[PDB]
């Protein structure tokens, strides 16, 4: 089709959605998941210590 100034405009929108997603969306979600996964490991350790 036709190449256009839209190629630069979309490149501003793309970078800024990646920067707000990188700071705000991703670190608080993955801290919250890993904080659950970690506790499951803590429960397993406790079962081992109890038996011993």
């Amino acid at each position: 089709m036709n190449l256009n100034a839209t190629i630069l405009g979309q490149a501003i929108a793309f970078v800024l959605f990646v920067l707000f997603c990188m700071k705000y969306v991703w670190p608080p979600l993955m801290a919250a998941i890993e904080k659950r996964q970690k506790e499951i490991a803590d429960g397993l350790a406790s079962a081992e210590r109890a038996h011993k």
Binding site: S46, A47, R49, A50, H51
Partner: protein, 52 residues
Amino acid sequence: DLDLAKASATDQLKKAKAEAQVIIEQANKRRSQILDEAKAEAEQERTKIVAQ
């Protein structure tokens, strides 16, 4: 489990500690029985030998 392992640890400690003392105390009862018997019959023997 993190609680039954605690409860059993105190349960064995209590029972084992009492029996170890009971054993050694009645070893002293046996010792003093043996000594009392010997200390008595030494004269029961001598009082027979002078009558002889």
